[PDB]
Amino acid sequence: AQLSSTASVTVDGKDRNFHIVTCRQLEWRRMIDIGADFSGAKVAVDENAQPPVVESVHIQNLSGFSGMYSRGGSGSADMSMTGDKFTISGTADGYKTDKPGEPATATFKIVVTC
Amino acid sequence: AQLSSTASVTVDGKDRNFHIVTCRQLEWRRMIDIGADFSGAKVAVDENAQPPVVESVHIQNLSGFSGMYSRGGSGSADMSMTGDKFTISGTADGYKTDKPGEPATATFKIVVTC
Numbered sequence A, B: 001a002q003l004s005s006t007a008s009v010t011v012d013g014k015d016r017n018f019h020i021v022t023c024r025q026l027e028w029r030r031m032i033d034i035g036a037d038f039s040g041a042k043v044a045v046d047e048n049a050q051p052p053v054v055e056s057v058h059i060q061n062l063s064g065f066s067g068m069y070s071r072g073g074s075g076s077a078d079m080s081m082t083g084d085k086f087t088i089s090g091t092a093d094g095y096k097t098d099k100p101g102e103p104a105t106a107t108f109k110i111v112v113t114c
């Protein structure tokens, strides 16, 4: 997540590294897409808020977890910048791939450089 | 959604009826929680958009399916309002709980009144 267009995503202590990262500016949000639709993470950031605010986090089939966070809903997501590097950390409700019929709330940390 | 605080959720043709519905608003965003965390659906709508758009849907252990939709990418959703009644249609990616580990897409219809 130090090299450009790379990311690491940790979910309940399990990591995935990505070389596939695309950031877009869909006003007024910065959209960070890590991985693929099938397996990856999508983060929407409001960069014009001070401090910047995470509007949503969708983790899909990543480290055995899928989860969904929306600002105003259950869970949380906080962000910080280290130079170009975003860190987005929080909790998200969803389900573990092993047990899709049971609820899971996982702690996540996304480190990503566009 | 015939009467207030009710919902019907159909996933790949299999319907569940709910009398447990909670709705919340954070500025532009309307959040609709149907059922329970163990078996239910959570919807985030952006009402600032004209017309309103579905931001995300998290279906949990409902009609034998758990899965996610978020705006962007291959999976999509559409919605309309008729008076107090929301109708939301789309696809979600997740798992049929009969077959854990086998990625599955499902067509959903949510009709809900807060």
Ligand code: NA
Pocket (backbone or CB within 6 Å): B069, B070, B071, B072, B073, B074, B075, B076
């Ligand atoms: Na999508």
